[PDB]
Amino acid sequence: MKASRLYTLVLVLQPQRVLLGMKKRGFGAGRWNGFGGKVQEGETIEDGARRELQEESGLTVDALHKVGQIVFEFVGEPELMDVHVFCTDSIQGTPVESDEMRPCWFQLDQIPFKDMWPDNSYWFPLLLQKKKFHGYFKFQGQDTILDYTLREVDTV
Ligand SMILES: Nc1nc2c([nH]c(=O)n2[C@H]2C[C@H](O)[C@@H](COP(=O)(O)OP(=O)(O)OP(=O)(O)O)O2)c(=O)[nH]1
Ligand code: NA
């Protein structure tokens, strides 16, 4: 089995809208996603999620709720991505656009699934229902899922 690298993903989910960030530069740009990145040495997963939210979106929150975990495998890549998914409903500043990321609010009847990673269509609806989940997705490139598993869980 492949080794896996730890990542976080943060969704700011308010009662009527969700905050997403559009990748501005590099390869893979043009998709909306939660805020996140690699966990760094010595930090807890939750603290890495708070750090990435601040660095990417400019938002500082005191805490996050863990809602899921999703493992991504890419054909031709040696490591899995072990992505710990967090939520919060409570913010106290404004999102900030950078050269790398543009944050944007979407109403919850306008979730931009067509411009999100294909796996999001499967697990995002569970997140919206206050459910917790574990998932795994194998991708060929950016657009094609070859295999996936998804399960609702009581505890993550
Ligand atoms: N399938 C899927 N892949 C995702 C999602 N979100 C997400 O970042 N990815 C993948 C695509 C990118 O290749 C990779 C982004 O991680 P990253 O390399 O930007 O993390 P980072 O910011 O710590 O790295 P770096 O820019 O500092 O080098 O993760 C998602 O929601 N679904
Ligand atoms: Na990132």
Author numbering: 1 to 156
Per the authors:
In the nucleotide pool, which is more susceptible to oxidation by reactive oxygen species than DNA, human MutT homolog 1 (hMTH1, human NUDT1) is the most prominent mammalian enzyme among other enzymes responsible for sanitization of the nucleotide pool. hMTH1 is characterized by broad substrate specificity as compared with Escherichia coli MutT; that is, hMTH1 hydrolyzes different oxidized nucleotides such as 8-oxo-dGTP, 2-oxo-dATP, and 8-oxo-dATP with almost the same efficiency, whereas MutT shows high substrate specificity for 8-oxoguanine nucleotides. Accordingly, hMTH1 prevents mutations and cell dysfunction by its hydrolytic activity toward both 2-oxo-dATP and 8-oxo-dGTP. Here, we carried out structural and kinetic analyses of hMTH1 and demonstrated that hMTH1 shows broad substrate specificity for 8-oxo-dGTP and 2-oxo-dATP because of the exchange of the protonation state at Asp-119 and Asp-120 depending on the substrate.
To validate the correlations between the structure and kinetics in the Asp-120 mutants, crystal structures of the Asp-120 mutants (D120N and D120A) in complex with 8-oxo-dGTP or 2-oxo-dATP were determined, respectively. In contrast, during the recognition of 8-oxo-dGTP, the structures of both mutants (D120N and D120A) show modes of binding of 8-oxo-dGTP that are different from that of the wild type. The face of 8-oxoG and the direction of deoxyribose are completely turned over in comparison with those in the wild type complex: this phenomenon is the result of the loss of two hydrogen bonds between Asp-120 and 8-oxoG. In the D120N complex, Asp-119 and Asn-120 interact with H-N2-C2-N1-H and O6 of 8-oxoG, respectively, whereas Asn-33 with O6 and N7-H of 8-oxoG. The 3′-OH group of deoxyribose in both complexes is directed away from Thr-8 and Gly-34, which are involved in the recognition of 3′-OH in the wild type. These findings are in agreement with the higher Km values of both mutants for 8-oxo-dGTP in comparison with the wild type. The electron densities of 8-oxo-dGTP in both mutants are ambiguous as compared with those in the wild type. This result indicates lower occupancy and/or loose binding of 8-oxo-dGTP. The differences in the recognition of the 8-oxoG and deoxyribose moieties between the wild type and the mutants give rise to the difference in the position of the triphosphate moiety in 8-oxo-dGTP between the mutant structures and the original ones (active configuration bound to the Nudix motif) in the wild type structure. The structural arrangement of the triphosphate reflects the lower kcat values in both mutants.
